[PDB]
Design a protein around this nucleic acid. Structure first.
Lengths: 14, 114, 61, 209, 120, 122, 56
RNA sequence: CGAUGUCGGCUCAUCACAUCCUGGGGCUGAAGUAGGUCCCAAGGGUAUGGCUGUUCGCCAUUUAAAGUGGUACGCGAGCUGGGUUUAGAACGUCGUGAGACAGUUCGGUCCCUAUCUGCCGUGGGCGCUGGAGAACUGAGGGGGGCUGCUCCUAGUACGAGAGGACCGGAGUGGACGCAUCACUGGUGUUCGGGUUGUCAUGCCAAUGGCACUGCCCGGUAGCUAAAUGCGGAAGAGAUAAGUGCUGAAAGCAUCUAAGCACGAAACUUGCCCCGAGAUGAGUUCUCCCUGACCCUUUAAGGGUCCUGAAGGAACGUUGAAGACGACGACGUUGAUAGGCCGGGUGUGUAAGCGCAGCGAUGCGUUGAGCUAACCGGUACUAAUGAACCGUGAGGCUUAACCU
RNA sequence: AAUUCCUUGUCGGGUAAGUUCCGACCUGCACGAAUGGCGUAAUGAUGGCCAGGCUGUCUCCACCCGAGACUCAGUGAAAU
RNA sequence: ACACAGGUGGUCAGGUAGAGAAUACCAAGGCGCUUGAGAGAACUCGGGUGAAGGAACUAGGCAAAAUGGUGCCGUAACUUC
RNA sequence: AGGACCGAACCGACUAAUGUCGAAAAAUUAGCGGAUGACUUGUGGCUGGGGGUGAAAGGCCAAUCAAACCGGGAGAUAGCU
């Protein structure tokens, strides 16, 4: 695949 | 069933006065006043008649001293003693539940007068 | 208040209630509860002391 | 004493002469003839085996037809085995009328219930509906959490979950009997007994006296 | 959970289903044999049958009730002229299901439902 | 079916006009009161010369419900407005002198016998 | 919600052990015609219980 | 650290007992009522609101009581996202400054169609040794178990009064649970009526469509609950803490070492439910099957012909049974379904015609007409003769019986 | 107080009960006068609170109408 | 990227009710959106109604529900009038 | 008259629900703000990467921005895996 989307953001944890 | 209808019709009293909804109806209910069997009169405008034979019922609205009261009656009950017609209302609807919203001058009804 | 994952889990806040007087004091200052507790025993001691000295000094005048 | 297999015939109510009204269930209870008095000889325990009702003879099976014409009793619907109580003692073919419930005053009617089907947990185990607004997503009736975490590591056996509700066999207990009729073969018991009209109610005198 | 309920739904909302029974009752009355699916047949009995029991008694009012259903005048004119006095002494059941296997495109059980007639 | 937060008119002439139920007595996690149960109210609206005032936390007892009470024959007696009679928290003996409107015969049980003589009906 | 490691040939076959198709085995020989039809369905020509009904 | 979603709430729980209540005791600075404290006991029970994102807590008012805890201070492949944990902005403050704060304020994307384990239901195969239709036995397993108030004893014991019991009983509520639609109600977009706008059937009249069922008013069957019925138990066995009796060691003393009694909501049993896959696969009752030929590798073998039994399955009409299988009723010698007839309920004086009214409309016909799922009936339509699987008297050993 | 830590400061009002709210005091950790001070009618998809209405948000869910789910036929992925 | 519930400027603009190019039903005209059939479970989505109570829910009346048009009477503190 | 009011087109995007391997790499449905203006829009220009433009968010500059994309220095360097 040419377009690989940005991964779904992580659960915070900070 | 045959069984329910025959066990039912052997307890329905055969003298029930016929009244339409909208009549002014005076019902007499027995009452235990301690050790006494008093016969009380509750009288107003009849606004609903459930019919199921033995399980038939009718509801009487009566604006008593302060506000409206609605007492529903099991017709074939032994505690009821008399059902008497006073007036005959010319309403044109089976269940007269509009009358809860109306008081006084607005809720006065017509007579059948036939 | 603020802290992050530390606030969400560690307790680090203390009420001390002097029962015969009914004077609580809640100290919620720092991250460790010990330097909240020693403070909540210092200010508790000073409030038993000043709330008594107003009874004695109240009964002077 | 023994119980009596009857049929549920709806519900009505009977007005007492003094003023109250009682909701009764009418149970047509025909003759419950014995097809087999079991005793301690070939069974170790003693019991009876009754039947009632009727079938078409081209609908009854050839094993069961021999099982009924062994006793000579007319092949009806079902068989129901009742436990005996060492004092009363029946014989094969001895018909049992509705008149065992004269002197008794409490019964335990057992019938196959009314199947509500695959009910979910709110209707089945009386769980509580979650908040049906305030952010809620796709989760208004679902049963919530079912276990704890890494330490239990499984769901416990007997967790209240969703599934088949009703069409079980239950037992209403200790019903005050109202009126027993001879020629009509009716047993009036107070209050609801399980199952819809046409069920097969086994009615025995109440064990909790 | 439809304990003792009746009335198939046939994957349609009510106002649609009333209209396919209003159309298909007319098309049955006009053609005297039709090929529809088996549940639509077994609910088409309960629609078409009282339209004929209404037609067995001819008057002014029954014409207007049988026009309030079927909404068409050919249908009410083949009733009260032809079909009614063909069932002048049939005590109900003017209808017939005949299963015709399955539909080709979607494997749906067919049925020729027809009038108990066509005695040419 | 008088439960918590329900507004009730006042039957008698004690001095309140509109009282709010705050707590139902006689059980743990009880949901609602009924025919003639003792409840705990505060007062939302007083007449000026009354014996009670606004905010005055006391016990009432419901005497009329729009849900209605059921007679044993299978009747029901629905009123057209909920109401109560104010009582005294420590001795119930209701504070009002005379009661406006009807009451219902189940209230005749060894502690409201003062009410059904002050009542005009039923 | 996804498989931790792939299943085999074996546990696929045992799940597919209920996808067998069922035979019909009820084919009537029609009264008049001798034709084969299912129980309670009309024949291919159209005779049903011997009686012609399709007229088609 | 090639990610172990972190506070509180919601839903759901589950165990421990260091027991909050209920139950049994000891001591008391125990007169009574009420307490204090300690021992045994986990069977059930264990608030509703205001404030704060809050846990916690303060308060209001209850209660029999408002238990302490483990479960990733249980539970986000279950919900939320108020605080906390980004990016915007500002206040105080610190820094010359970008910026910064367990300092404060306002705004701030919470994904997953479940393979395996588990759990709730519900099926197919085969076993149980000849097959089949049922009826149970009960190993085991589960559900259940809460408590108030009023009254009698009695205003007796107790007390100077003040107040105010033990033990045994009876009625009635609260919370929870089971069942049901007979009542009271919800619903009832499948029934009846009203009515707005517009379109249609040539037009009036009449209905019909579409407008969230157009908007509403009533409501049959069903399901339902706020509604109505019932439940927890009584008892029995063995006990814990405890109380004894007899009784030496140890002339006395002692509930114990020998011996015998009592003693709790806990345990076993009693109540209800699942239940012989209880492979240890059980018991009873019934019905069913008794043909010949030939090959061998003469084996509980294979194999040909004639038969197909009880039964089941399939198909059809279906059901107060159901996701699907399943389960129950019926299949013409028939009421299983539809239709039809009579009823019932519901709605409420149809159309048409007549009269009155200039007309909107009113009266007569008329308590009419229409009336779903309901009730008693009725073969009118639809449930076809068969074909299909299942056979042919059931292994070996030992034992007591007849013969 | 968009500033205040101690602190849910003290008193008053609202409420049965108010860490929020409004008014006041001033003990201003650490407001303050164009990095504006104090007010301010109208305005605001702005922040905090209160009341009347209105109601299935809630006590506590119940029933119904549709579209999926489930069954049959046809084509038939994906993460891992 | 697709025979994709998205985006794209101009011109015409009928009837009844309507202030209206809103909105409802229609004409001319064009479509029924390229899987259907069935059952009528849980549970999810989009809706209807609801006894008694009425914010007790909740972080918060979020979401619903309710109010709604035209004429006429009438309208407070405050104000930069 | 009006950076006036209510409200369609039209421009936008405050709220909730759905959607989150969707119909869609930001949408839909019911509400919602502006709607003679500091509006909005068609078509053509113009500004070019330490540069643009910015009613200012480090926003936007071809689904990419605290320094675009493409080719090169280039096989950078990597005490790291």
């Amino acid at each position: 695949p040419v377009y690989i989307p940005r991964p779904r953001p992580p659960h915070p944890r900070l | 069933s045959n069984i329910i209808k025959q066990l039912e019709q052997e307890q329905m009293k055969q003298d029930v006065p016929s009244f339409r909804p909208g009549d002014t109806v005076e019902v007499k209910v027995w009452v235990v006043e301690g050790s006494k069997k008093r016969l009380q009169a509750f009288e107003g405008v009849v606004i609903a008649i459930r019919n199921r034979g033995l399980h038939s019922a009718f509801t009487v609205r009566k604006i008593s001293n302060g506000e409206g009261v609605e007492r529903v009656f099991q017709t074939h009950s032994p505690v009821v003693d008399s059902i008497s017609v006073k007036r005959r209302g010319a309403v044109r609807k089976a269940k007269l539940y509009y009358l809860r919203e109306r008081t006084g001058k607005a809720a006065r009804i017509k007579e059948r007068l036939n | 208040g603020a802290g992050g994952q530390h606030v969400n889990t560690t307790d680090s806040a203390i009420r001390i209630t002097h029962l015969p007087t009914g004077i609580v004091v809640e100290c919620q200052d720092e991250r460790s509860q010990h330097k909240n507790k020693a403070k909540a025993l210092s200010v508790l001691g000073a409030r038993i002391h000043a709330a008594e000295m107003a009874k004695r000094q109240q009964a002077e005048a | 004493m023994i119980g009596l297999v009857g049929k549920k015939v709806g519900m009505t109510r009977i007005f007492t002469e003094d003023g109250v009204s009682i909701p009764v269930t009418v149970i047509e209870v025909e003759a419950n003839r014995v097809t087999q008095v079991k005793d301690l000889a070939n069974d170790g325990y003693r019991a009876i085996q009754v039947t009632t009702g009727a079938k078409k003879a081209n609908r009854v099976t050839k094993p069961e037809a021999g099982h009924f014409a062994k006793a000579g009793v007319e092949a009806g619907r079902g068989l129901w085995e009742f436990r005996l109580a060492e004092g009363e003692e029946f014989t094969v073919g001895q018909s049992i009328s509705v008149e065992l419930f004269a002197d008794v005053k409490k019964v335990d009617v057992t019938g196959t219930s009314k199947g509500k089907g695959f009910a979910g947990t709110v209707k089945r185990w009386n769980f509580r509906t979650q908040d049906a607004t305030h952010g809620n997503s796709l989760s208004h009736r679902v049963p919530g959490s079912i276990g704890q975490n890494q330490t239990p590591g499984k769901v416990f056996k007997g967790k209240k979950m969703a599934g088949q509700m009703g069409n079980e066999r239950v037992t209403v207990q200790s019903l005050d009997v109202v009126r027993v009729d001879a020629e009509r073969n009716l047993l009036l018991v107070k209050g609801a007994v399980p199952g819809a009209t046409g069920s097969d109610l086994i009615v025995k005198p109440a064990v909790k006296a | 959970m439809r304990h003792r309920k009746s009335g198939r739904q046939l994957n349609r909302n009510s106002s649609h289903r009333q209209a396919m029974f209003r159309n298909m009752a007319g098309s049955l009355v006009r053609h005297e044999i039709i090929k529809t699916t088996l549940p639509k047949a077994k609910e088409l009995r309960r629609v078409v049958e009282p339209l004929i029991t209404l037609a067995k008694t001819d008057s002014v009012a029954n014409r207007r009730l049988a026009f309030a259903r079927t909404r068409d005048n050919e249908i009410v004119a083949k009733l009260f002229n032809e079909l009614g006095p063909r069932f002048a002494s049939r005590a109900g059941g003017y209808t017939r299901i005949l299963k015709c296997g399955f539909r080709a495109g979607d494997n749906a059980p067919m049925a020729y439902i027809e009038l108990v007639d066509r005695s040419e | 079916m008088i439960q918590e937060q329900t507004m009730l008119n006042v039957a008698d002439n004690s001095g309140a006009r509109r009282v709010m139920c705050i707590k139902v007595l006689g059980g743990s996690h009880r949901r609602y009161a009924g025919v003639g149960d003792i409840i705990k109210i505060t007062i939302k609206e007083a007449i000026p010369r009354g014996k009670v005032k606004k905010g005055d936390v006391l016990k009432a007892v419901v005497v009329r419900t729009k849900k209605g009470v059921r007679r044993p024959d299978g009747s029901v007696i629905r009123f057209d407005g909920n109401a109560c009679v104010l009582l005294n928290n420590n001795s119930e003996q209701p504070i009002g002198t005379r009661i406006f409107g009807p009451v219902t015969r189940e209230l005749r049980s060894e502690k409201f016998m003062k009410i059904i003589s002050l009542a005009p009906e039923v | 919600a996804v498989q931790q490691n792939k299943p085999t040939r074996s546990k696929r076959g045992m799940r597919r052990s209920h996808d067998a198709l069922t035979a019909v085995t009820s084919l009537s020989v029609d009264k008049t015609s001798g034709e084969k039809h299912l129980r309670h369905h009309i024949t291919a020509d159209g005779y049903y219980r011997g009686r012609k009904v399709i007229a088609k």
